């Protein structure tokens, strides 16, 4: 239960370093979804990000693995969470 509050992510987007050399932008285009665009990885290889959603409607955190190429997008439901963190899987 650490991260940025989802309420602080807007349609404009915010950029994160998930782990060394791996950068992504998160956008919140509606209150139910989080859109992740992969921006850069070491060697431009497929990412290996762990997304952790917590708080809010969630009594316990939920995690999702995101393995996508730079330039690709992953949409995920936020499940009423308050908080999100990006880490290395």
Numbering used by the authors: 4 to 92
Excerpt from the publication:
Avr2, a member of the ToxA-like effector family, exhibited structural similarity with the SIX7 and SIX8 models (Z-scores > 5). Analysis of the models and topology show that SIX7 and SIX8 both consist of a β-sandwich fold, strongly indicating their inclusion within the ToxA-like structural family. We subsequently utilised AlphaFold2-Multimer through ColabFold to model the interaction. We crystallised and solved the structure of SIX8_C58S at 1.28 Å which confirms its inclusion within the ToxA-like structural family. Despite this, AlphaFold2 models were critical in solving the structure of SIX6 and SIX8 as templates for molecular replacement. When the modelling was repeated with the SIX8C58S experimentally derived structure included as a template, the interaction models and heterodimer interface were of higher quality and essentially identical. The region of SIX8 involved in the interaction with PSL1 was modelled incorrectly by AlphaFold2 when compared to the structure.
Previous studies of Fol-infected tomato identified a number of fungal proteins within the xylem sap. These secreted in xylem (SIX) effector proteins represent major pathogenicity determinants across different formae speciales of F. oxysporum. Currently, 14 SIX effectors have been identified in Fol consisting of small (less than 300 amino acids in length), secreted, cysteine-rich proteins. Here, we demonstrate that despite their sequence diversity, the Fol SIX effectors can be classified into a reduced set of structural families.
